[model samples]
Target: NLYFQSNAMAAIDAALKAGEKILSIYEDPKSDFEIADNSPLTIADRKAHEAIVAILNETPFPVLSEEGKMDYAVRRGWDTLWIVDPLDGTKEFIKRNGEFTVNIALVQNAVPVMGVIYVPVKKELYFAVEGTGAYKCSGIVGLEDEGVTLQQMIEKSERMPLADARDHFIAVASRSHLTPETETYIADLKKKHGNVELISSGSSIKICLVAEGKADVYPRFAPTMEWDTAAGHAIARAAGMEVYQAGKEEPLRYNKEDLLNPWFIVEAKRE
Candidate 1:
């Protein structure tokens, strides 16, 4: 038998509140949202950050957050911690694309045991636990096919699965951070695979694509932060896919001194 902890449920609720906080700011684009390192930072991000941090603090567990603490030592030693991105996909939020989300993950021994990703605009919450399986709560739109994989389904001609399999492989990408190396890899994939649609999502929703089976593959060719991918990767992996490291066949890892994530692809298993 398996069950989620109170903290876990609280974490998901916290993500929703954070998403709400962000939506409040996203509704008004002219509301003086600042830019950090060229990325948009609206008041929603701070509000969500504050709410999530406060909730996690109540558990008395060390926390690592995208908009909060940055010190490496605070996270490196803790056996368990809460990892969060209060407001993910700020660019999408700024553009009113409605593809942004709030991500929260629980980590133990450098691995995610569970996670939640809440899309405020869509009012959808996607979540998973390591052994239990994946689910969506509160009825978010565009998540009709929850917790499925690519290899298990039939192929669509317009969205054929990777390796000629019956799957629609959607390539999620960053418009701002496109790199030449990533383009080269895409060119190679194009030669072998067709129906590869590029989905321009700003944040961790790319991983959610695999979780929902709406997309089969997502190749990330740019730099990312640990908090950026941890929660989404946890949900995606629990859904029976992988967040593979670039070049290497293994999945990306967490809790690094640099805190920067290597480029990776979100892939569904074969059969």
Candidate 2:
């Protein structure tokens, strides 16, 4: 389950605290919100961006981030670097549904070595380090405070004690990118699972949802870059899950030959 444990636990703690700082800004309706390209950005996004980038930069590796925009040309030279989406699910953030998240990934030799995805509203952290396995930690809003420590989550996952998930799967899809292929896939899942549900989410948060077992499956039978899925894919695999091409059943790889991932499915268990 959890093969490695370290001071990174503190980093996880720091990430939640930083997310708190960002959430303060998010909840403030008076804060200035802007549009970047076609995507949204808010004061919360900036605050979280600064906080995560700083934490990740504490090490020597260069950082490539969605909020910390820079050209891919410069990124091509780094042998090791962090790929981040300081604030993923901007649309969800703006919607105030609390489905948003912050993502950080360490990429070495074009492969993810570690990753963390924090859903601030839920106060849940999903993380993993390559070969160490993935873990989930839940936090209390108040009272005595209860949650499985990172180690415990890892241990529990390793036992493969997960409850019997719905045979009629829960399928996650983009709020904006529902395609014919995706629809057809859902149709197939419905037939296989005996029933199926369609759920919509934004950004990489959707990936983490499947990784943490909140949903049974998510198929993105459309465009996505490796950086977009690498961090969450690391979490999925570590948690005894897989992210693979829809029909071929091949595990998705990062920073490899083609950065654009083939239409893939991030599943709790393979078919």
Candidate 3:
């Protein structure tokens, strides 16, 4: 069924609300720090996490958040959960580039069945529900303020793969986390396509770009966590894209004992 699930609608609503809170902190800078692993931290991260978790808690699923991690031993037993990055691209946030986002995904049976990504600065919302379709809505701030329904969001939004013009191939890459292997991968793409162009993006926006068909593919040869990509992965898949583990036929799965993801590539079209 392509019908909307309440959980998925709640995620979209929660993400928009969280984005509003994050923008407040982003506009006024007072706090800065580093996490245990030394990633950039901000008051916005905590505030956004608190807001999103509070909203998602209204639903029934347990949450695994970047700001609030649950023990794997406990989480591994669950067949369904919310995987979230309340403030993705903290580094980009720190850089004041307005490239970060709020990412939320619903994982069932280790597969992402729904996702919502909100860019506060851009006021853009990207979302997907498995079996439904991926969509992008700009000026999302007003949509909520005016009390738009989820169905209205679907009707007003543009369906993804905006166009399929393939005169030249473009690959989206991480701005801060680019790895040496990614350079090699891009080189391979260039050799194969002969007109491959590489573009740098922050956070899951790279995946969203591929999802919307603005970019042909995104090769992440660098390390990432399940939370980092789950939301975008769902959107990409909903847009008829695929996220395949490097050299594997299987797509990336969530809720593993080891949450770190292997190198993967997201293509607008299956290759």
Candidate 4:
């Protein structure tokens, strides 16, 4: 009866461990890093991946993470598995912008049933399970312990989409992955909602912004992989948000033969 809850707790634990590993490297002055094309800190990425892998060993599902990849032939066989991004905002991490996150999700078939994203720097943890709704907790770093149970964590968390009741429609954009098409999409929002406020963040936090009702929408016209968006997609859906493809109604799918995610938009509760 608590299958989803159990998996969700595992994902949350995995994300927490991953975040701790990432923060260790991040806080170290001697930690080596370089700015390359798409991302950086292969060191932190690898460490976070290893940490999450250890925590996820409690579960039975196979894992598909950014650092530990599997062939499509093998991946196609699993109807259920763990999809992870050890450090999603690699650039932001390198920049020390406190925007990176550890993303973990439990996917069944092609849809994410449980998701967890932990921002180590900010100490914000967002999680959700299918049919149970989404929740967000702050200062989670200090709240961690071996005996910390899922029910206790949920009890401390506030339900997502916490409204501030603002008039202007807020549109979220990627801090680093922003594209011309995405800018145009936000521009188009002016036609319908005159006062459009632009917000920005790196990686999956863009989806979290919309899920939290801090932003009204987020259009991802740029490229993203399955691991990049899966956890965020689950949280957004559980928060009563719709994540649809640019012009299509069908939402993004995970564990596809092609791991690349298509352009999608996160639509929050707004007219």
Candidate that would win on TM-score = 4
* lDDT per residue as tens, model 3, 1-271: 3434778878988888789888876775453433333333456777788888887887888999988955778998989899999988867787778899999999999998899999999999999988879999988773445766777778999999787687888988877856789989888898998787888878999999999988988888988999989999999999999888988888999999998999998985556
Candidate 2's residue-wise lDDT over 189-228, tens digit each? 8888766677877677677778767677888888877767
TM-score of 2: 0.77
Least lDDT summed over 10 consecutive residues: which range in candidate 2? 1-10
Model 1, 1-271: lDDT tens digits are 1224556656766786687677777776566544554334546778889978877888756788887745676667888887888877756776667787888998777777778888888776777767656665555432223642221211111121113344645666665567998888877776777766666665787787777676767787888787878888888777788888887887777777887889888888545
lDDT of 3: 0.85
**TM-score of each predicted structure versus truth:** 0.81, 0.77, 0.92, 0.93
lDDT of each: 0.71, 0.68, 0.85, 0.84
Better of 2 and 3 by TM-score: 3
Model 2 regions lying over 4 Å from their true place: 1-7, 10-14, 32-40, 71-73, 140-161, 164-167, 175-177, 200-202, 247-249, 256-260, 268-271
Worst 10 residues of 1 by lDDT: 153-162
Candidate 4 structure quality by residue, lDDT tens digits, 185-207: 87788677978788888778889
